[model samples]
Target: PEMPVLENRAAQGDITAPGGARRLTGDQTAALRDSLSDKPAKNIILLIGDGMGDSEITAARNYAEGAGGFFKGIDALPLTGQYTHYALNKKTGKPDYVTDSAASATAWSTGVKTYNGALGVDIHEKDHPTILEMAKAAGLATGNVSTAELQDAVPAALVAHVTSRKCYGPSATSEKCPGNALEKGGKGSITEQLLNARADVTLGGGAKTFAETATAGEWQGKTLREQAQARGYQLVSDAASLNSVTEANQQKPLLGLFADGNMPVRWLGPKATYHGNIDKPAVTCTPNPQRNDSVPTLAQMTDKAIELLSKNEKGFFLQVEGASIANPCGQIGETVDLDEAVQRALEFAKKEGNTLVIVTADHAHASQIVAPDTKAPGLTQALNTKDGAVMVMSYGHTGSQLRIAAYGPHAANVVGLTDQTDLFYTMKAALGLK
Candidate 1:
């Protein structure tokens, strides 16, 4: 057994080739559209497990299916899925190699591709607006949550500015204001916009961005918490308070901020302890903390966000983000982070189906996912190779296709050729804002 026999694997797959139309059986295709053949999602909960792709989803399915080949949650859906990449010009409609996180997210959030630094706006410098803004305008209870910085491009594009996506210098906001800058600097930061927003429920990291403003660059009259509270919101900054939450009367905004910066990805620094294992195939788990440092797990943050965001009548669009997946997608062995994001997204959807849940990524990471093998046990026997290493490639985004899927209402037929711009439109359509 120690000979290390060269595994002659077939470089082949049952691939659903791109752009080639597959004629569905009379009943098969009809059944696909039957789930919501004529319905609309009353409440959309677009849960983007940012950076999660088909490969990442495969890793998660392996772990869940226990090598049996079965997957969990919406992943189990007989979805007519396909690969979606970035547009040529993005929002600007020009030409670029691939796309950045900002540009990528803008496509999903605005339905139009823009430059990497622009949010919901187009490259022509147009304001395309955000899904959250659209939901609020439509009188729906909107929410945006992430285990990363709240204003990180993915979640932010779902709510804030359309033109700029930079996380600039401490005082650069004011300098960047180009009139109609809305409120202007410090307070006008994306988080501030969410705090003073019509979003009924909002939570996640980047508490520093909206912490007590000091002045000018950040005037310190009242912290964002104070502002949220002033507008009849119930604010909780820690997990304990988040658990003991009470304002479920559906009358006020509920905000929970559990981190100062981006939360830990549970793979680096202190993440080896989550689900209780320095190694996997190790234990039956409960929702356990990973790093237990200053950061919290995506599931924990997700639960907290759910507890607080559900206090509204119009329903909410909870954007649960399992960030840090981006880290692993950059490297092969780091697939754990991305896997965790996809797993958590499936879990979140199961816990909150009353909300429209769609899981996808901003862009793909390099050479992620392992091919299925006979070695795969049952449904989950799949194991990633990382080319048989434990480290990551560490830089650069790959040109793989992203996922566009949904559940709750009218999800089965989203399968088609599209760009990130479809993201913005999908969220709108999900909430019936169309």
Candidate 2:
């Protein structure tokens, strides 16, 4: 696959002027045609924006760039299309229009529709093998990175299987997912399984869960953190510590837990309130104080992950997630953050010319860009955009199809409408995994 040549056309006109904000520099029938490829991939970097949909993407673009402006990373993928992400109703075994992260993650991770709150399991509670596990088994290095806790639905789905998404640690597993708890002769909790899975690289939050002691098995009573070190895991907590690590593999895998739970978001602003868009002045997002230098951004983590995982001669499979979809500013900031991570992946994939880079979201989130003057019954916030316009954002999840884009080997597979489950097969085939 070839990287699309991007020429700067911003100097041609003032964006605020009418007809001046046109994005395409010129029509290029050749460029789009050149982006397609069916070759097997040596590496696959899958980036998932949890709860990110069209509305969430548009609101962020409008806030950061003008309506006509495009994201350097998110919008740069040459092949793009849409996909449906509906979950299965466990009891009825029917389509559930709205999906939570767990079921949605399971769809692409395991290529199967499952009930909401279930991770790496079918509606009947049967465990399914994930792409990450398959990739590792085939001698490819594997990684799971996220801004959310490592035990969160998206990341956990790749490394663990449980009846409920709430089973993060031993206690939660024993209470909420008793059938899968370690003491009950099941696989164990999400964190326990994560340790057992032991990908080449595992970077994210959830240090709190590591404090929980194991209830059963060979490492019984040992704290999860202790077990990790004993198992030859190189642990790092902050950016400084993480940066010092140079190698990660089967002998010494990397485990960087930066926060107790979900890491703090990148931006902060007023929360949406009933009639807030019309009643208050449009606001701009500010840097979140809690998100300081000590905490690594999604882009930084992606860079490090790719660097470490790419060391393997066989290949690598990596999942990078921007995990927050919170208040308006928070959501927009995370979208931007995820875009940077996408940029990192794209840079590597383009240069390597054999890595498959797939970008998509687990589910559609609540947050629509509505008319500024419209009075929404639910939560609403107005933001001043780069276009010098007020964009009113309303919160609530919708059963809408999501955008999926890709590049590198097998990139053409994402060019038409498909189901989220198809992604698993695409990646599996791209890496030549059985």
Candidate 3:
């Protein structure tokens, strides 16, 4: 095949403002309309691999594409499209430069630009409603799932409404404070959104953020989880509890918490945690004796979400965040790799059944797919990352290319160019959101 010319814009990671919405192009719109299926999309499963930057994505792609090794997630999904990530600002925004986890998530949740640390709010600090709110307004089932505590910024952006983005509510806010004035733009905390007397499924990390003690506030009458339950929610704090609270008992909203703060990266704690839920592991054993956990994993959570949300006749909008990847540099790069992220996506897509599975990242982070090394040593290690060897490059968020994976009705049509803001329209269309 003749070589194709790629836009030579230097890949730089920076925060960007959401571009203006685009009129569907002839080719793009045509390809989109033709590929769509008549199958009605009942649920929108959005899986965000937070900072799987280009180098890191490439590394994962190499394995998935078979240039190196293929992880189960990428191997299972049909890789047919690519996306370009530009800040509403410019190329190469700093790790602190351009896009951050908060802004990146806002791009998806609210479909706009807000300075980093701001969630569900604009650059001028205006409150912008997120997808979760829109989904609930339309009377559909909804939830947020992440390996991180459920209350972090990325997940909070959807369900919380706040003026300060830096506030962590009651969880990790003690260790590092960006400052009191950092509230110029607020996250408003999804604490209200969760108990908004609307949402159906609330999962992921940041559980502390929901407690009255988290942000030093109290719910009108009860805990946010209780409010949802008071409205009709069933809570499950761990794996055994999750098993007992299956779809059969999903007569009310569901809350599942697996981590004290954020769930451990797949590679960090136990391999079973990689799946991050209940499944084949319960029936099998790993050779690594150190790997052990009673908590359900992200994958298991995704599966559970599909089961319960599907029960709703109104359809469901489930937002799953692999937030740790988006989290600032942590022990993650060592434990969780790109493959594990893809595994989480693949597992959910498989179990989501007929749901619309939208697999994308909030924003690229300090993660890159390392290019493969031409000269390698004998017997390369399995899952043993070769530092300075061939892999996807640009591990950190540096205008790294973002990817969108889809299946069901609007699956194949999402291939091609579009700004982050355009993402809002995609979800709205996929879910029939007004």
Best by TM-score: 2
Clashes per prediction?
37, 2, 75
Which lDDT tens digits does candidate 1 get at residues 265-335? 45422222222122333222222254563444555655555555555566666666667532231222223
Evaluated with lDDT, which candidate comes out highest?
Answer: 2
Q: At residue 98, what lDDT does model 2 achieve?
A: 92
> Model 2: per-residue lDDT, tens digit, 245-358?
899999999999999999889999988888889888888899989988899989999999999999999999999999984378888999999989999999998889889899
lDDT at residue 373 of model 3 (Cα atoms): 38
lDDT of model 2 at residue 274?
Answer: 85
Candidate closer to the true structure by lDDT (higher is better), 2 or 3: 2
lDDT of 1 at 44: 60
- Model 2 alpha-carbon miss at residue 412, Å: 0.6
Off by over 4 Å in 2: 5-19
Instruction: Give me the overall lDDT of model 2.
Output: 0.90
